[PDB]
Amino acid sequence: MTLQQRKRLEAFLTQKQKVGELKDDDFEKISELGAGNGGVVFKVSHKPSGLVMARKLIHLEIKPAIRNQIIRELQVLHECNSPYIVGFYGAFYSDGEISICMEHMDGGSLDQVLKKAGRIPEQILGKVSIAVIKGLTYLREKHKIMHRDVKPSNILVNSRGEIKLCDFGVSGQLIFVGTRSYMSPERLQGTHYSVQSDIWSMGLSLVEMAVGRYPIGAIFELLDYIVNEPPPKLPSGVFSLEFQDFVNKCLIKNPAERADLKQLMVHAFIKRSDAEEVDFAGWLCSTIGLNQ
Template identity: 40%
Template sequence: MRPGPLPMTRPSHPGQHIPNPTHPRRRPDLTLPLPQRDLTSLAVPLPLPPPSAPASSVPGGLQLPMATSACAQTPELADLERVRRIGSGSGGTVWMVRHRPTGRIYALKVIYCNHEDAIRRQICREIEILRTADNPYVVRCHGCYDRAGEIEILLEYMDGGSLDGRRIASEPVLADIARQVLSGLAYLHRRRIVHRDIKPSNLLINAARQVKIADFGVGRILVQTMDPCNSSVGTIAYMSPERINTDLNEGVYNAYSGDIWSFGLSILEFYLGRFPFGEHLKRQGGDWASLMCAICYSNPPEAPSTASPEFRSFIACCLQTEPRRRLTATELLRHPFITRTQPPVADIAVSTV
């Protein structure tokens, strides 16, 4: 049974950005029109810092970094030794790196770009804002380097990799994963930070079975304007209907509820072991036009009848066509699917599909 209208907290939208008067122009005679930014709805999809996490071992006897204060000094780039490549894409490469003075291990995201200096500086400033966050369910960002046209971002290393391609059929285990991700989302949304690209590949796990929100697709922001809040950052397959088709919902896009749609789709994918709208539509080279039509005009995906009533209700509370009917992250944390069981003691048993 589909739920009726559900309450949803609408985030506020404060006024326009006011330039900082402590930074006078060097050339008062020069002007440059800049887009207005809503800094309280910062929508740069970057990994954010959690607090402390226990050290754990990784292959080769390397030591994972003990978490430090979110405002700790950024390690010198020259002190980072590249150990091996752990990921790559069109926007850049991710390396496992060792901090020589301490032996600690990090992930270093290297973004290749040739944008003008002003845009690179803006990106680094936004990363510095994000690294002040402090939550155990988001990946720590330790700092940013701007070197020779490259932007390099130092991140917490998650030795278990992403949850992309995993099937998680156990509802108690899935509830624990959902609880961790929702806790991270609730924290970000309270700080008026919108992720905009929640999907299985951006949910990482470590040896302690901690699940954290990240985004290894950060290179996408470099091809956008300096107003990422209004740009098409994100993966189409996990976008909400009103984000793809701006005619829906009377042209109003609530980015916070958009994150909830993407989250619900990801959780349902874990349970099914396949993309809810069709595996052939998800991957690159698929029929994107058909996928977008399915997202915008078909009924939202539902959990199968074999699932528990609590799980079916939980998914329905996320995958509502009307954004105002989706529960917020804080409300979802109180849903019976999350609260009915204690977090599983055993390791998360997941299978690759």
């Protein structure tokens, strides 16, 4: 950690304390940040602190004993404190819906950023990759947590140039209803799986952000393709050989021959990217623009 990262984390944990138990009454809606797989996210104001938060509403049908164990397992999120993880405020049940309250990220997700930028430059994706790896490393080492839901909508960014992971499961399992999938071939097979599965998800997400589009290229037809056909790749000529090799190594279908976190962190793409002074914050703020 840099001193500034060390300090930014300090700064967050103090006003987190300036927050008591959370209740539906204490929240005031500002705007809607989006929705997804059965979750609605709202930009909220928490009046007792006056703090801006993001509040996710999860309609989990049926309580009672099952809902109170969910909230108690969610309490580990208080201990997840990293410059590569989104800050947690608290969680409760209300009106048949679990609410997870977290740090508000003003740049939104890289899914939203991509939709704006068209495609995200390779040098920026180096900064994103370093952050994702470090966040996945942190979750593994400090909490023995695997993410299980790496994708562009779960990598959040802000006007301070921070890149953070969110929506990592903490309740066990509890682990295709949509049109796209970031699940590895081995996860689709029902096979046992590990953090190698998150590496595939990261690799796929990177190719989506580099080219501007989900790269595979009906839901069950798509899943069959992931399982049975060659992995996606970057186009040649427009991306560095080492970036191509980096995603290729993330996208090897055998999770055991696929690169691991340790290997990727010393990979030539990561080595090069880490030494590059790239103004990511300026890129992001110039790309999204300012509220006017």
